[PDB]
């Protein structure tokens, strides 16, 4: 009797924290993907146009 | 520029009178223009043989990471 009890109760939590770990993850760490290379992307491009301005004028 | 008056008075009047000519201030010489032409190459090595009356320009580029 008494082992069923905790193995439905083990089976259940375990689904009930990888799915809401799952969850709360995937929205932030997504946006933070997009926001993350955005930053890379656009600040290069800050540094070319103006060493450059830089390098002539020397 | 100018000191010993007792040479200096016809010292410096020679040198002023290669300014008052323009037959090169008075001549140039030869020796001179030599030198000139050579040492003026040289720099140009010195910082490149761009020309410095032009600025430089830069091109663009991006890709993806994922």
Redesign the interface.
């Known amino acids: 009797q008494l082992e069923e009890v905790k193995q439905a109760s083990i089976k259940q939590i375990q689904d009930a924290i990888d799915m809401e770990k799952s969850q709360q993850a995937l929205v932030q760490k997504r946006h933070y993907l997009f926001d993350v290379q955005r930053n890379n992307i656009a600040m290069a491009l800050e540094v070319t146009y103006r060493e450059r301005l830089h390098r002539v004028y020397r | 520029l100018d000191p010993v008056q007792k040479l200096f008075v016809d010292k410096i009047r020679e040198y002023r009178t290669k300014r008052q000519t323009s037959g090169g201030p008075v001549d140039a010489g030869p020796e001179y223009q030599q030198d000139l032409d050579r040492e003026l190459f040289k720099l140009k090595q010195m910082y490149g043989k761009a020309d410095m009356n032009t600025?430089?320009?830069?091109t663009?580029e991006?890709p993806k990471?994922?």
């Open positions: 600025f430089p320009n830069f663009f991006d990471f994922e």
